[PDB]
Design an enzyme around this catalytic site. Structure first.
Site, PDB file in Angstrom:
ATOM      1  N   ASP A  35      67.295 -12.544  92.777  1.00 47.64           N
ATOM      2  CA  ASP A  35      68.538 -13.010  92.179  1.00 47.64           C
ATOM      3  C   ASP A  35      69.702 -12.098  92.549  1.00 47.64           C
ATOM      4  O   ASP A  35      69.889 -11.050  91.938  1.00 47.64           O
ATOM      5  CB  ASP A  35      68.366 -13.057  90.651  1.00 47.64           C
ATOM      6  CG  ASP A  35      69.599 -13.558  89.935  1.00 47.64           C
ATOM      7  OD1 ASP A  35      70.492 -14.106  90.613  1.00 47.64           O
ATOM      8  OD2 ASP A  35      69.651 -13.417  88.692  1.00 47.64           O
ATOM      9  N   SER A 199      85.997 -17.699  99.988  1.00 47.10           N
ATOM     10  CA  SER A 199      85.908 -18.731 101.003  1.00 47.10           C
ATOM     11  C   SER A 199      87.307 -19.180 101.391  1.00 47.10           C
ATOM     12  O   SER A 199      88.231 -19.164 100.580  1.00 47.10           O
ATOM     13  CB  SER A 199      85.104 -19.914 100.449  1.00 47.10           C
ATOM     14  OG  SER A 199      85.116 -21.028 101.325  1.00 47.10           O
TER      15      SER A 199
END
EC number: 3.4.23.22
Length: 330
Positions: A35, A199
């Site tokens: 994770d 992004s």
């Protein structure tokens, strides 16, 4: 040193991925959910409340000659999906794919929430976010990666998750045969303890690319792709009959649909998520309403590039003094 381990979807939907991890002496192999959105290595154990164990493999520290109680240390964690676990702490030898750390904090669960009990395939989590998020008190502990880092050939790990197939976590090296083209690296902020990056935009299907900054986290421990409501609406508007359902808890679409791809930007590069990766199947057995793999982050408080996005790429988690993230097509 290096390590290399195969990671395998837990079910036919790629809801999560498990990776075998050796703990203790002699080795006890548990299948952990790696994770990158948390920083605790915790396991089902001989100390876990019996009624909360249902099929998991447990770590039994009393059977490990290298286990030592970390006196006075406790831990307690809550995840973004509302699940939780807590317990006490041992140090022990932990190996992943041939890479060994001695003195790793292994957090033994005394209590786990129902979502963990109900998932027989996940024996615990291995956190790979920054150690500043580790919950051990009163002495915070380091992640497996942080402990291994100085010994690694290169201070990196990579995630190569498969679509309906196994993939690989590598530690200490970049497998140049595992991706196509070049790897594009992008800046990371560690301010919130995550692999947080920005992004450069998105496209829906064959549509034009929209240049827009989307701050979010690369999180292998989250199944879906969670993005701003504007972006998510633009995606589902291209699927006939798709709608946001408050009763179901997100966007659903007719199972008869063909889903468009979704592209996200990494600098000037582009990662394309095929439409099929966005299908999470019937909302309930036999239903013709299917659950979408792109969902709104509104009310999460952060955008999450979870498995839906990451499995479309070869992803480098670069833990150099100034960390960065790399993405390549594959």
């Amino acid at each position: 040193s290096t390590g290399s381990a195969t990671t395998t979807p837990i079910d036919s939907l790629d809801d999560a991925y498990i990776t075998p991890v050796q703990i203790g002496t002699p080795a006890q192999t548990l299948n952990l959910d790696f994770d990158t959105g948390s920083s605790d290595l915790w396991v089902f154990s001989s100390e876990t409340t019996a009624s909360e164990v249902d099929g998991q493999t447990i770590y039994t520290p009393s059977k490990s000659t290298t286990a030592k109680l970390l006196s006075g240390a406790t831990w307690s964690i809550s995840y973004g999906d509302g699940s939780s676990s807590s317990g006490d702490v041992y140090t022990d030898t932990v190996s992943v794919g041939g890479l060994t750390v001695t003195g790793q904090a292994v957090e033994s669960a005394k209590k786990v929430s129902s979502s963990f009990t109900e998932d027989s395939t996940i024996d615990g989590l291995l956190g790979l976010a920054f150690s500043t998020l580790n919950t051990v008190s009163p002495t915070q502990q380091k992640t497996f990666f942080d402990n291994a880092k100085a010994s690694l050939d290169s201070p990196v790990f990579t995630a190569d998750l498969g679509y309906h197939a196994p993939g690989t976590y590598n530690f200490g090296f970049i497998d140049t045969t595992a991706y196509t083209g070049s790897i594009t690296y992008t800046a990371v902020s560690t301010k919130q303890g995550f692999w947080e990056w920005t992004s450069t935009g998105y496209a829906v299907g064959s549509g034009t690319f929209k240049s827009t900054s989307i701050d979010g986290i690369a999180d292998t421990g989250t199944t879906l792709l969670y993005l701003p409501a504007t972006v998510v609406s633009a995606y589902w508007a291209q699927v006939s009959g798709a709608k946001s359902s408050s009763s179901v808890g997100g966007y659903v679409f007719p199972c008869s649909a063909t889903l468009p791809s979704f592209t996200f930007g990494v600098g000037s590069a582009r990662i394309v998520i095929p439409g099929d990766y966005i299908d999470f199947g019937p909302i309930s057995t036999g239903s013709s309403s299917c659950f979408g793999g792109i969902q709104s982050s509104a009310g999460i408080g952060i955008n999450i590039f979870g498995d839906v996005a990451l499995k479309a790429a070869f992803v480098v988690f670069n833990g150099a003094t100034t960390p960065t993230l790399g993405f390549a097509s594959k």
